[PDB]
Symmetry: C2
Subunit: 276 residues, 2 copies
């Protein structure tokens, strides 16, 4: 009923990333499912309430289609005033993979018209931009390597976890929890939340990092990971619910599948610093 | 109480996919699928199931660009020897495709897969054919996408048959040029000439197999690789709905053809043409 917003400031924040959520309903109100409509970045100094109220006035059509996977096409909308920085997305058709932006696309009807009734807006205040490690770099696996993964635990208003990959180290040696904790502590990792793709985890490397790992991170000290890519099912649970990082552990694992039969995981609990 | 199910869409070869509970080795956490692929076998399905249930398969949660599940190498084998290349080595899969709730799998303790269901699809020497992702993702101006909307009845109450659990999935077959009013009547007759036949399989969990038994244009048949038998996996179309089919009886309750514009900007101009009860469902 009452539309709401949430703002995140991970890390002169002139840029704002927007993602809104709405009920997909029969225009004819039978609710079919909830869907996310990512709008991307725009330079804006408008207050969230003004952006939220203008988004709620828009008429956005929802059409279900297929390619290699199920897709959702959000129809063009307008007119705009505070949302003019996002006019490229809002005034044209936008197509997304249904798995990422909807939990029950199987319930959206084809024989009757469907519309999105926006009820929530999530905002990430940015310095813009966000850097993400390329998908091909994240998928690289090698023999005799230790994948440096992080296990993030979220408290949602329910405790849940998601895992992300930072890079690999070459394996030598008994990797104790104490030795690894010392090396990871020297990196001075800082974690914070955003809403890029629903929920995003932002990492700032504030300490020392080896040249090998830094090269795998594109020589970037600020990294962003979207829960939409890590786990799109858990991502749905964070959309219009307040989230907080409760704990972060580092999990050092083998890199190739055959080495999972040989080497067990090294679990280093409570790594880094959560920026409140 | 492990069980099995055989699908014969439309043999010598069989595709296998099994489902199990991911449990603490020292407490069920989630359910996961272990696709094993195709192998030539004469063993009875009851013996394949009994041998899979005796194996010790470890489960490890990890990350790449997305969450992954690593199933440990298993053995020794006898009836499953035709699938030894997959079984006797580590196997990695995207958690979105093979695991219900990967977030529930522990990292601080050992996990194993307790298999309780084996799904089998009997295949011919032809094997299987899927339209490549690049051909399916192609979009063009002034085109009509010929899509099919398949309704599934998952674990339906058979006693409620014929008196007033339904989900659906959509697949893309190819495009036609939009010239000329594309009425429900004209398109219905063109599609009826194709004489499409639909059947279920278990490729990737649940798959839909289409046989083109009639006449089709050369321009549209080229987009299907000139293959009269097409297979579409629900693991690719909708991995969330696919998870609900695992260890549940499924039936195609209805199929409609949906003709839509191809590029997003044309969705503002042209509405969808919905032709209900197209083709022939086999069982």
């Amino acid at each position: 009923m009452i539309p709401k917003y949430k703002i995140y400031t991970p890390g002169y924040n002139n840029y704002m990333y927007l993602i809104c959520y709405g009920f997909v309903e029969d225009v004819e109100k039978k609710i079919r499912t909830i869907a996310a409509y990512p709008l991307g970045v725009g330079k804006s100094a408008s207050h969230p309430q003004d952006l939220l109220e203008e988004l709620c006035s828009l008429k956005v059509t929802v059409r279900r289609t297929a390619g290699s996977t199920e897709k959702i096409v959000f129809g063009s909308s307008g007119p705009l005033n505070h949302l003019v920085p996002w006019k490229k997305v809002l005034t044209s058709g936008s197509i997304f993979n249904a798995v990422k932006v909807c939990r029950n696309v199987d319930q959206i009807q084809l024989d009757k018209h469907q519309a999105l009734r926006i009820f929530f807006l999530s905002i990430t205040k940015l310095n813009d931009g966000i850097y993400m490690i390329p998908r091909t770099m994240l998928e690289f696996r090698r023999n005799n390597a230790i994948a440096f993964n992080l296990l993030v635990y979220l408290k949602i208003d329910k405790v849940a976890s998601f895992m992300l990959h930072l890079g690999n180290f070459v394996r030598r040696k008994y990797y104790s929890v104490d030795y690894c904790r010392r090396k990871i502590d020297r990196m001075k990792l800082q974690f914070s939340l955003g809403s890029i793709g629903g929920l995003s985890l932002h990492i700032k490397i504030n300490g020392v990092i080896s040249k090998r790992l830094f090269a795998q991170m594109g020589f970037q000290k600020n990294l962003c990971f979207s829960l939409m890519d890590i786990n799109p099912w858990l991502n749905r649970l964070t959309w219009n619910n307040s989230c907080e990082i409760s704990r972060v552990a580092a999990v050092l694992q083998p890199s190739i599948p055959r080495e999972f039969m040989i080497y067990d995981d090294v679990f280093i609990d409570n790594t880094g610093r959560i920026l409140k």
